[PDB]
Design a binder for these strands. Structure first.
Ligand SMILES: O=c1ccn([C@@H]2O[C@H](COP(=O)(O)NP(=O)(O)OP(=O)(O)O)[C@@H](O)[C@H]2O)c(=O)[nH]1
Ligand SMILES: [Mg+2]
Length: 1715
RNA sequence: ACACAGAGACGCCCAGA
RNA sequence: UCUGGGCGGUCUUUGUGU
């Protein structure tokens, strides 16, 4: 309506004013809604408006009741345009036209109505519209708009004299209209009615997928616009880029894009590599001349024997050549005493039994003469501290004793220069000969007494564990849990676990003593709390060695562990003593975790051999061998020890190689080099050599049975005993029992510097093979441009075929959106960033200063403080800094892995911002690839599974499948970082090239810090005498005696030009490997088409690729016996030619690859053996004890639950899950101070009073469904069935026990460097909308940063390695010194008494309101709890080798945000919105539309707690392994292997029974929640005028929108009065196209639909669908298959079962009715 | 004792003889 | 080379992705 009257009524007097916000609610009565007929075209959406329904209150003058139309591009403002079009005047002007330019960057955006004709003013009446149901969101919108538009106007005020400006804001919502210019109630009513009718139009229009998936709002368009503006105005100064980085000319990119691939070179090179591969495969694999398989195997065995003997001779020639040595693998005594109690006759016989005897006697004399206090803590003294709220001796050791101790490292620094110490040091470096006699290790492994019963079931430690386990099982006390508990007791009464108990106690007590220091000659003596073993301890410091000597009376040792693998013990008169041994912080974790490790090992290797936990059987040879091997690996904890058994997987996968090809296990002799320093290493190496000889002698026998393919003849990697396939795969994985987190000494940092340099120094001198020309015999780091063009074109063809034509525009828009939506804060994280700069280059200046890495969060917050809020506004500054620097800065360390040796690089702050854009670009490009899995996880378990279906469909029954599991070597340093730029720039638009090329061109000069301490100890070592050229290379490179290109005179860095870094260009290299795999796929299809005699071989080829590990799968069908051999030969040639085709692409095939394997593939350690999927369970079983350093006590339990779930999903039965949860309980209580605190039993007794998990109680899963339910499920069960619910209800009615680690010394400092305000809580409270959205301004980003830094995740992120020793070192004072915090400092005994004195003031239970508030998922918890009583006793039968994968399965966050702030986040319409909000109000009565009303009248003081509450309100799904009512089936099948415990038609019958019985609520919602589909209806009801039509109406238009099989089915329908036909069809999920088509046709024929009329649309399309049949997407005719609430009458028909779902016309549609 | 085809660690900072 | 004392979320130490 009129604007001049609205403008002229205001009068400006002095200057700029904001006005007064007037709020006008609904005052006058409102009519209904006019009749609206909306139709969506291919170019616009148009509305016909009917008569206004009886405007008795003069409301509706603005509407015209005629015809209106809008565009698709203008549709997203369908409210903001149509509501406000009466006041809209076409101006297209900015204030910059009427005000002089102040150069503030505000000269381009039109700010809505800016009517100027009032005495020379500008008003800028700027407009808005919201869906808020309250005032708080309206106030937030007003504040956001005024903050957006206030500052530039005030900046532009002062340019002219006497300003007259008067800015204003209008906001319209359903609840009312708030403004600031003078407005009367009538036009406010008009605007609100226009808003209601426009919202109705928008609701009708939201049944169109062109608008549902349209751009959300102006935020996405503005992000795309700013990204476009940055990308079109970014000058990287390319001449400088060429001047400072090598190989940075644009001409490489121009010639790659312009000059096509030379077909003649490709044709010549392919036949050259084909004949080379044929010659190599004949020569190496013995085909010329012709021979049988047997003699081929014998001569391959001869080659293997010769190669192993050559390696043995080479290792023996560099050793000390000794065939006998007395060395113990386990350096701990074999004592297994009987612990009784605290027990602190010729004490002179120890003096003359050596130096250790002298020390022990002169210590025990001080013990007897001195004070008992100090050795152990008195219970009374510790109890006197909690309620009321170390022994050191200096013996005069002799010179001989001091020298003997210094020989073993005790005070060895002072006696370094003596002759004996120097001789010991010289002999220490000697390598052991491989021919050393190690028969004792094999004798111990084969025969031992580790699993024999120890008979201490009535022991106090076992009594404590038993009572705690009985209390944990008291709430579930049935027969099955009792049987498995008794089995755990038997596993706790073995000899090995009883030895491990006192060993773990010693390790934990050493970890406690690691923080103590002693003077020269002082020692610390203690007694084990249970066992009568005395420990003498020499502490140096925490980061150095701890020394210990053990002593025990000869009468207290009841029995010993058999075997000669133990170190010699000194035999004195009445005591047995052990020499001084050393440990470190890293080595203690394995010894702490020892009894749990043995318990889990016994459980796993007991069930894997087929004996039940509840059966009694004597241990066999192989079980003892596996347990002893695990014991020795855990006790030794050395990298070279586990490397040999790690390589056994790659060695033993070669036994699956099919003819014609021989097994090649002797290719791994290259990685088996290196010195051997222990007897166990020698034994493992010889067993590995024997395994290679046995593998080369005979392959694994692949037997085709009646319905499945099986493998026989498989055997253990080390012990060599014949076992099953699963046992072999698991035995490949015993080497991960070593700790990941191994502290690396400085002397090992040099050798890991080799891999950076040893491949850099061989850079080719000519860069004309680095991307310029073509080469048929390429050196490493070189590649062919033509081959890269061919592979890139092949992947381009694949992407265009899969995602339709003009896909580059979609890729451009998604890349622009992804870049624009990124802010500064998302890249801020608690990951380490480098601090290396130009000031750190010269060692002559940084010799004293020590280098510390900073946090990325701190630097990103520093950039936030400087007024940088968007990501694109920092990349330019980062590139300016990097280009001025001239190089990219990197700092290194070592990865704490198991698979080998690996260096890890860390960027500075500048390079990360540049790398992030390229990373997102490459990820978005790889998302289009149909065989890339790094960005598409769903393809990991899809391509392998669907290959069988494709082979069955295309080739039919009887298909031979041949696989190749390729792995690349040196994936990072091999790729010269010009290939990746070319590959990325092939797929990207033309205007994005000049940033992609630059950002990747900075990887060609890498500037890497080396360790400063390494430089300090190398500077004073200018003379080197090592038998390795790299050591002297480092020495004279640092000292400048020679010239190298990778280190200069006195520089703290190394230069690296060739190669990328690890994972830094992960997605781009994934794209490159996808291109290579696509080229190989096309080439393989071509060769299978051209045949071998000219007759084609009918076969299917598909490839999968990740980062460097790929797999090629080829299924072929021979037609005869003679054809099969030739076809297998041809396929073997094709799969072998990749090893020579890869160097043309610069990829080097490793010896880790297993080529030409039938019915077997490995991709990501996921071994697919035909229809039997194999996972290594031992990795997750060994992963069940590393926990994160957390502050709350229950968080330890939830971490244990997470690790337990990880162990369950790896393929473990529920019995192992229960047993390893028992071991987790034991581990948690030992960390609580079970073996280090005198006051545990009383603590134990106090847990009689209260089983509170927050106070230190461990909850246990139900043994039938253990691991699959979280910790919160156990908490819920305990609250319902025990008295814990009373305590929780009392605590809630009154208104958790958490401990600070280091009292937040670092955290607070991390706060103080940021400078964040301490008053941010009220700023969050006053604008509730700062969350639930992303960001809009600098202040809200700062507030979100302050919210991020005050989070549990960032709190539990400053923890360092060796978490278990640091946790257990606090176990001596966790109970009896004030360390916990309650919701000041108080000991946990005090917390238990405070809980106990309030236990008398307890009553009732948890009402439904509190348990719904606290325990949000209670419904499915009860549903899964009520499905467990059907099987409760050990009743069943023994009847598994068919293990496959199985899976077991609006929300309030969107609802609250939409209601309170009007942000579109829900699919549901207004009716369902009101219904869901009413249900949420029924859930919590304190909720209200006003945010302030909910804040003030709620239990949360500020909005952040409310936000975390809503986040915690909002599904748990678990993946298992087993054979192919579902819950009952998987529980019955997955309890124990081979043992049973006592479209889907069945689901359709269940739904029908529910419909006839009406057990639940709406049957439509029950069907939808059951994942069945077929729910929806019309939105244009096919307008019906008169009967003469074909069904009265059925003419003109019509759309059916609904959900079937989780899709957005939006079938367009149209009739001409004589027939009805579909027009366009849209689908969301393309999982099962054929079943969806069948269901669609079945729905269609019930109403009557013809597909004769094809279409009128020839645009973008993925599949074109003719009549009831799939056709090619663009051939002819068809229709464009496109990928992007009331129940009144369910009557039935006759003679057929029917469900009347008649939506808007007299025809019945069927859901699942049928006959 | 740990690390290593001999680079390290086996204590480190403080005023006093 | 001795004398007194002080020393822990110490440092080493943890990157790119899923
Ligand atoms: O922790 C990791 C592990 C793997 N990766 C990335 O994944 C790649 C493959 O991981 P990889 O174990 O195969 N190492 P690679 O350099 O290929 O040599 P090799 O072990 O002999 O085959 C590596 O080259 C890294 O780029 C990481 O970035 N971080
Ligand atoms: Mg690899």
């Amino acid at each position: 309506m009129n604007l001049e009257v609205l403008c002229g009524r205001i009068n400006v007097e002095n200057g700029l004013s904001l006005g007064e916000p007037g709020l006008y609610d609904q005052i006058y009565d409102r009519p209904g809604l006019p009749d609206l007929d909306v139709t969506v075209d291919a170019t616009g959406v148009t509305v016909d408006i009917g008569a206004v329904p009886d405007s008795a209150s003069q409301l509706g003058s603005s509407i015209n009741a005629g015809l209106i139309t809008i565009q698709l591009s203008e549709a997203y403002k369908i409210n903001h345009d149509f509501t406000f079009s009466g006041l809209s005047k076409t101006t297209d002007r900015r204030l910059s036209e009427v005000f002089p330019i102040t150069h503030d960057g505000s000269d381009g955006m039109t700010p809505a109505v800016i009517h100027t004709r009032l005495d020379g003013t500008i008003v800028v009446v700027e407009f808005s519209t919201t869906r808020s149901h309250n005032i708080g969101g309206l106030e937030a919108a007003y504040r956001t708009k005024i903050e957006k538009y206030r500052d530039p106007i005030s900046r532009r005020v002062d340019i002219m004299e006497n300003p007259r400006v008067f800015f204003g804001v209008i906001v319209v919502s359903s609840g009312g209209v708030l403004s600031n210019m003078p407005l009367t109630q009538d036009e406010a009513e008009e605007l609100m009615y226009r808003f209601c009718i426009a919202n109705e139009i928008y609701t009708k229009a939201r049944s169109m997928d062109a608008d549902i998936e349209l751009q959300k709002s102006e935020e996405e368009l503005e992000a795309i616009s700013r990204a476009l503006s940055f990308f079109s105005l970014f000058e990287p100064n390319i001449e400088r880029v060429e001047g400072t980085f090598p190989n940075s000319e644009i001409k490489m990119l121009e010639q790659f894009l312009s000059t096509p691939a030379d077909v003649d070179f490709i044709t010549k090179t392919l036949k050259a590599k084909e004949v080379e591969a044929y010659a190599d495969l004949c020569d190496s694999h013995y085909l010329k001349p012709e021979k049988t398989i047997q003699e081929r195997l014998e001569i391959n065995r001869c080659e293997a024997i010769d190669k192993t003997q050559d390696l043995l001779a080479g290792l023996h020639a560099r050793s000390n050549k000794q065939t006998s040595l007395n060395r113990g693998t386990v350096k701990l005594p074999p004592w297994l005493p009987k612990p009784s109690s605290e027990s602190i006759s010729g004490f002179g016989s120890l003096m003359d039994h050596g130096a250790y005897g002298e020390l022990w006697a002169k210590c025990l004399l001080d013990v007897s003469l001195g004070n008992v206090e100090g050795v152990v803590s008195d219970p009374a003294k510790e109890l006197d501290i909690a309620i009321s709220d170390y022994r050191r001796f200096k013996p005069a050791l002799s010179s001989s004793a001091r020298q003997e101790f210094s020989l073993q490292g005790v005070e060895g620094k002072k006696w370094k220069r003596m002759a004996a110490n120097q001789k010991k040091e010289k002999e220490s470096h000697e390598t052991l000969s491989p021919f050393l006699d190690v028969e004792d290790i094999g004798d111990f492994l084969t025969f031992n007494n580790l699993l024999t019963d120890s008979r201490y079931g009535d022991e106090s430690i076992q009594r404590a564990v038993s009572i705690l386990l009985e209390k944990a099982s008291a709430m579930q006390d049935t027969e099955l849990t009792h049987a498995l508990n008794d089995s755990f007791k038997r596993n706790l009464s073995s000899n090995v676990v009883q030895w491990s108990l006192w060993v773990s106690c010693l390790a934990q007590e050493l970890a406690s003593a690691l923080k103590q220091h002693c003077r020269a000659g002082e020692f610390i003596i203690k007694k084990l709390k249970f066992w009568p073993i005395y420990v003498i301890i020499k502490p140096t410091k925490s980061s150095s060695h701890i020394f210990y000597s053990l002593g025990i009376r000869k009468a207290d040792v009841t029995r010993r562990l058999t075997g000669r693998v133990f170190s010699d013990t000194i035999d004195a008169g009445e005591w047995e003593l052990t020499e001084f041994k050393s440990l470190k912080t890293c080595k203690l974790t394995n010894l702490v975790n020892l009894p749990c490790t043995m318990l889990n090992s016994i459980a796993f290797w007991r069930e894997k051999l087929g004996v039940a936990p509840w059966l009694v059987r004597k241990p066999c040879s192989e079980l003892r061998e596996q347990v002893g091997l695990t014991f020795l690996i855990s006790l030794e904890d050395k990298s070279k020890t586990e490397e040999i058994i790690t390589l056994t997987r790659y060695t033993q996968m070669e036994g699956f190689v099919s003819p014609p090809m021989l097994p090649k296990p002797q290719k791994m002799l290259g990685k088996l080099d290196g010195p051997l320093r222990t007897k166990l290493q020698v034994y493992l190496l010889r067993k590995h050599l024997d395994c290679m000889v046995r593998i080369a002698s005979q392959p694994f026998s692949l037997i085709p049975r009646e319905g499945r393919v099986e493998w026989g003849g498989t055997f253990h990697a080390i012990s060599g005993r014949s076992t099953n396939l699963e046992n072999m795969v698991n035995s490949w994985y015993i080497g991960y029992y070593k700790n990941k987190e191994e502290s690396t000494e400085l002397n090992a940092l040099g050798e890991m510097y080799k891999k950076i340099v040893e491949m850099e120094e061989d850079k080719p001198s000519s860069p004309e093979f680095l991307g310029w020309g073509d080469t048929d015999s390429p050196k490493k780091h070189e590649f062919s441009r033509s081959f890269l063009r061919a592979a890139c074109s092949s992947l381009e063809r694949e992407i265009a075929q899969r995602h339709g034509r003009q896909w580059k525009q979609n890729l451009e828009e998604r890349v622009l959106r992804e870049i624009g939506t990124k802010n500064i804060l998302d890249l801020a994280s608690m990951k380490a960033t480098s601090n290396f700069s130009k000031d750190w280059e010269l060692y002559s200046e940084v010799q004293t200063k020590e280098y510390h890495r900073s946090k990325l969060l701190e630097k990103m917050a520093t950039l936030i403080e400087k007024g940088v809020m968007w990501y694109i506004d920092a990349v330019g500054q980062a590139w300016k800094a990097v280009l001025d620097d001239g190089c990219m800065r990197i700092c290194l360390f070592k990865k704490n892995q198991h698979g080998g040796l690996r260096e890890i690089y860390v960027m500075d702050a500048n390079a990360r911002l540049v790398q992030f854009g390229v990373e997102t670009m490459a990820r978005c490009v790889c998302e289009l690839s149909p065989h890339e899995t790094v960005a598409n996880p769903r393809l990991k378990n899809s391509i392998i599974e669907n290959h069988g279906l494709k082979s069955a469909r295309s080739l039919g029954p009887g298909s031979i499948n041949i696989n190749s599991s390729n792995d690349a070597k040196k994936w990072n340093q091999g790729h010269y970082t010009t290939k990746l730029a070319l590959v990325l720039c092939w797929f990207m638009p033309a205007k994005f090239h000049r940033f992609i090329w630059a950002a990747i061109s900075m990887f060609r000069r890498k500037k890497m810090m080396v360790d400063l301490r390494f430089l300090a100890h190398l500077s004073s070592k200018s003379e080197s005498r090592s038998s390795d050229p790299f050591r002297e290379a480092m020495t004279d490179a640092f000292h400048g005696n020679r010239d190298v290109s990778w280190m200069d005179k006195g520089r703290t860095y190394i230069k690296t030009e060739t190669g990328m870094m690890q994972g830094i260009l992960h997605f781009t290299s994934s794209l490159l490997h996808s291109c290579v795999q696509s080229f190989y796929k096309s080439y393989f299809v071509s060769k299978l088409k051209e045949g071998y005699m000219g007759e084609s071989i009918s076969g299917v080829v598909d490839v999968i690729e990740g980062s460097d590990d790929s797999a090629i799968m080829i299924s072929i069908r021979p037609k005869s016996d003679m054809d099969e051999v030739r076809s297998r030969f041809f396929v073997a040639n094709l799969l072998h030619s990749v090893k020579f085709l890869n160097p043309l692409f610069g990829i080097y095939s490793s010896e880790k690859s297993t080529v030409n394997t039938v019915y077997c593939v490995e991709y990501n350690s996921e071994f697919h053996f035909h229809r039997h999927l194999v996972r290594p369970t031992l990795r997750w079983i060994a992963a069940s004890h590393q926990i994160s350093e957390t502050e709350a006590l229950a968080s330890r339990q939830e971490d244990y639950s997470n690790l337990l779930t990880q162990c369950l999903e790896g393929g473990a039965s529920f019995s192992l899950t229960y047993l390893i949860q028992c071991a987790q309980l034991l581990h948690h209580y030992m960390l609580l101070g079970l073996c280090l605190h005198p006051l545990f039993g009383t603590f134990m007794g106090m847990l009689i009073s209260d089983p509170d998990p927050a106070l230190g109680f461990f909850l246990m899963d139900n043994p039938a469904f253990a691991g699959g339910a979280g910790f919160r499920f156990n908490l819920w069960r305990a609250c319902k069935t025990t008295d814990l619910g009373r305590k929780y209800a009392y605590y809630f009615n009154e208104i958790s026990v958490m401990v600070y680690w280091g009292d937040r010394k670092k955290y607070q400092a991390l706060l103080n460097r940021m400078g964040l305000p301490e008053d941010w809580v009220e700023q969050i409270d006053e604008n509730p909308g700062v969350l639930y959205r992303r960001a809009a301004n600098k202040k809200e980003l700062l507030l979100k940063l302050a919210e991020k830094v005050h989070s549990p995740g960032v709190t539990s992120s400053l923890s360092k390695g060796h978490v278990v020793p640091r946790v257990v070192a606090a176990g001596v004072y966790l109970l009896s010194r004030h360390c916990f915090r309650f919701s000041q400092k108080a000991s946990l005994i005090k917390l238990l008494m405070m809980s106990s004195i309030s236990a008398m003031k307890h009553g009732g239970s948890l009402n439904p309101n509190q348990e719904r508030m606290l325990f949000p998922q209670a419904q499915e918890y009860d549903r899964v709890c009520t499905l467990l009583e059907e099987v409760e006793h050990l009743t069943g039968k023994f009847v598994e080798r068919n293990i496959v994968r199985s899976r077991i399965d609006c929300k309030a966050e969107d609802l609250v945000s939409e209601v309170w702030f009007g942000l579109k986040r829900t699919k549901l319409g207004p009716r369902l919105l009101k219904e869901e909000w009413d249900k949420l109000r029924a859930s919590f009565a304190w909720l209200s539309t006003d945010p302030s009303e909910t804040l003030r009248d709620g239990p949360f003081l500020s909005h952040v707690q409310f936000r975390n509450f809503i986040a915690h309100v909002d599904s748990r799904s678990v993946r298992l392994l087993g054979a192919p009512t579902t819950i009952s089936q998987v529980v019955r099948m997955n309890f124990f292997p081979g043992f049973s415990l006592e479209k889907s038609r069945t689901m359709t019958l269940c739904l029908l029974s529910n419909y006839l019985s009406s057990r639940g609520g709406s049957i439509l919602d029950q069907i939808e929640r059951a994942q069945s589909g077929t729910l929806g209806g019309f939105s244009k009801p096919q307008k019906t005028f008169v009967r003469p039509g074909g069904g009265v109406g059925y003419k003109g238009k019509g759309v059916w929108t609904g959900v079937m099989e989780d899709t957005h089915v939006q079938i367009l329908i149209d009739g001409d009065g004589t027939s009805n036909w579909l027009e366009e069809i849209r689908l969301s999920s393309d999982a099962r196209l054929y079943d969806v088509i069948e269901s669609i046709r079945r729905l269609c024929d019930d109403l009557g639909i013809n597909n004769r009329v094809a279409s009128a649309y020839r645009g973008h399309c993925m599949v074109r669908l003719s009549g009831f049949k799939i056709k090619p997407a663009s051939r002819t005719d068809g229709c464009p298959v496109r990928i992007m609430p009331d129940e009144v009458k369910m009557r039935v028909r006759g003679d057929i079962l029917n469900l009347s779902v008649t939506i808007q016309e007299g025809r019945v549609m069927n859901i699942l009715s049928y006959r």
